[PDB]
């Protein structure tokens with residue numbers, strides 16, 4: 262059976278289990294069950310399922326070289342699917358809450374969940390909470406007796422926490438760190454001293470890389486009982502690297518991809534994001550370019566957003582991106598090489614993750 | 622050492638551990654550490670600590686009748702304190718998110734967290750997320766090797782989920798169930814057919830009783846390794862009953878306690894809450910009283926909120942409250958009696974929980 266139809270079949274199974282359990286144990290009525298079904302479909306479906314399918318792909322690699330009964334192969338593939346949906350629901354939680362936090366309008370060519378007429382922020386914040394709670398309901402039901410439950414829950418917990426810390430890094434990236442104070446309304450940075458590669462790297466590592474690359478790879482190893490087939494430090498280092506590349510590509514597309522293909526109107530410039538474009542521009546700008554950037558960045562005024570996009574264009578950031586990309590290819594190829602020492606199979610799953618990221 | 626100074630000492634220990642771990646493992650800077658310290662103090666401290674201290678009290682009861690080394694007594698008391706702070710942080714999460722959801726202005730005589738000038742909703746939603754993530758960081762660090770970790774995490778998970786489901790029950794309690802539809806803006810009920818005791822009971826059981834009474838009692842039993850000293854069905858039934866009484870008292874105070882003593886201006890009437898007052902009023906109103914209620918309920922207009930408060934006053938709901946209270950006393954005394962069959966110690970902790978609720 263093809264990996265994707267297995268994954269989607271498990272979505273239907275996990276949805277039915279969750280909604281049936283709300284009816285049998287949580288006293289839910291049919292109308293609220295329907296609302297939660299529709300919230301689940303709207304918030305969890307419609308992407309590429311890259312994160313969840315990575316768990317499945319890693320598990321498939323190990324199945325091709327490991328002796329098991331047929332029934333055990335089916336159990337491992339089911340477990341990989343459930344663990345993949347745990348990550349897809351964790352993401353769904355963060356996308357719902359982030360869209361509310363950032364006052365976002367669209368995602369994947371549809372209104373943000375909170376903007377649905379019958380939802381509103383009051384409901385959406387709690388729907389987000391429910392989405393993350395469903396990750397734990399899935400785990401405890403499907404993995405109750407599994408030898409990897411402890412390790413999976415502890416990892417999942419740490420990655421969820423890392424993500425929430427990265428969110429804090431991201432929402433505060435345009436503030437001066439010395440001025441952060443719950444008692445005082447936060448002015449935007451005037452110097453942009455904190456728009457550095459190391460500070461950018463810290464945001465992306467916590468907000469994106471742990472849940473998008475580390476967790477899917479390590480969960481594929483845990484459901485496979487294969488974590489001692491790998492050097493965990495190499496897994497962390499290659500996750501780091503690939504996830505950062507993913508986020509740099511995202512940041513470039515925010516500014517330069519047509520809205521019709523992006524699924525939204527990019528607002529990183531108006532939101533004064535610590536973006537790869539802003540850090541890379543400041544890393545090569547002359548004094549006049551820096552001064553014009555400070556005059557225009559972080560403002561809704563379309564004229565000022567256009568002055569920032571023209572500054573980025575004139576600054577030939579395509580060159581910097583090509584150089585960054587070439588350095589990432591060297592380093593990720595080097596880490597895939599080191600991974601082949603303890604597991605060729607796992608090294609090959611990382612190579613697939615990298616291919617799917619590099620030209621998406 | 623007095624229970625309360627032990628509990629507060631552990632807050633300082635757990636705060637230091639969390640902030641030190643953010644610095645050693647999550648690359649946090651001093652200014653963001655200070656912001657999170659202040660968010661933790663502002664959102665977790667200043668209440669009565671009833672929920673957390675219940676874990677400590679249940680553990681203290683078992684210590685008085687169970688042979689242990691001194692060091693083991695100290696470990697159980699520490700564990701009860703950490704488990705109590707897990708519930709206090711879980712509550713803090715829900716109070717932050719609920720204040721944002723409901724557009725609340727004050728809590729405990731201070732602005733809601735999201736309303737602090739240097740916070741805003743963008744940050745506060747994520748601060749709420751962090752608060753619940755800290756529950757899991759506490760558990761995994763302090764309880765890593767504990768025999769009760771599995772059972773504690775599974776219970777905690779289910780109670781958190783129940784609470785989020787109850788939130789959904791509460792925010793949708795003024796909608797007609799058949800009209801719930803994410804695609805369609807929700808009108809307020811015109812008939813109030815769903816303002817019934819059974820529907821009220823469902824809201825309160827899920828939103829309040831699991832985290833405020835069931836979880837503290839059962840966590841005190843888990844850290845004590847004493848869960849087979851009790852009939853879990855009796856624990857669920859007495860938690861049910863006491864928690865509902867707590868929420869009925871809350872609802873009455875929303876309408877009738879001066880704001881200076883409430884710590885806020887009650888808005889349940891304007892928010893069209895399915896409150897004990899609204900259900901109890903509709904349970905005894907004549908046709909003209911019901912019609913005037915429908916004309917005025919669920920509107921910001923102070924004149925209309927005053928018409929609802931005068932309707933409640935004229936309706937002598939004090940009588941209904943006295944009758945309800947008398948029925949709760951019978952039933953809770955009956956359940957404390959049944960609990961004494963398997964554990965007198967535990968029965969006595971439930972009696973203390975009830976006394977502290979009954980005349981607060």
Ligand SMILES: c1ccc2c(CN3CCCCCC3)c[nH]c2c1
Nearest residue numbers: 355356359424428468469508511
């Ligand atoms: C699709 C889905 C997720 C992402 C992210 C990652 N960020 C999402 C926002 C919430 C938490 C921060 C991480 C960048 N681009 C995306 C395209």
Ligand SMILES: c1ccc2c(CN3CCCCCC3)c[nH]c2c1
Nearest residue numbers: 509510511513514517578579582
């Ligand atoms: C500035 C920097 C880089 C680029 C690119 C190259 N793109 C490759 C497609 C994947 C996403 C990365 C961007 C096109 N326009 C740019 C302007």
Ligand SMILES: c1ccc2c(CN3CCCCCC3)c[nH]c2c1
Nearest residue numbers: 715716719784788828829868871
């Ligand atoms: C102090 C603290 C908590 C409560 C509640 C319980 N509700 C809180 C709001 C969030 C989740 C629903 C439960 C009622 N009155 C309170 C006084």
Ligand SMILES: c1ccc2c(CN3CCCCCC3)c[nH]c2c1
Nearest residue numbers: 869870871873874877938939942
């Ligand atoms: C309507 C219903 C009951 C009452 C009470 C009795 N109060 C006892 C104090 C604890 C909280 C419950 C309320 C005073 N005014 C009321 C109006």
Ligand SMILES: [Zn+2]
Nearest residue numbers: 359362363431
């Ligand atoms: Zn965001």
Ligand SMILES: [Zn+2]
Nearest residue numbers: 511512515529
């Ligand atoms: Zn982006």
Ligand SMILES: [Zn+2]
Nearest residue numbers: 719722723791
């Ligand atoms: Zn509320």
Ligand SMILES: [Zn+2]
Nearest residue numbers: 871872875889
């Ligand atoms: Zn209330």
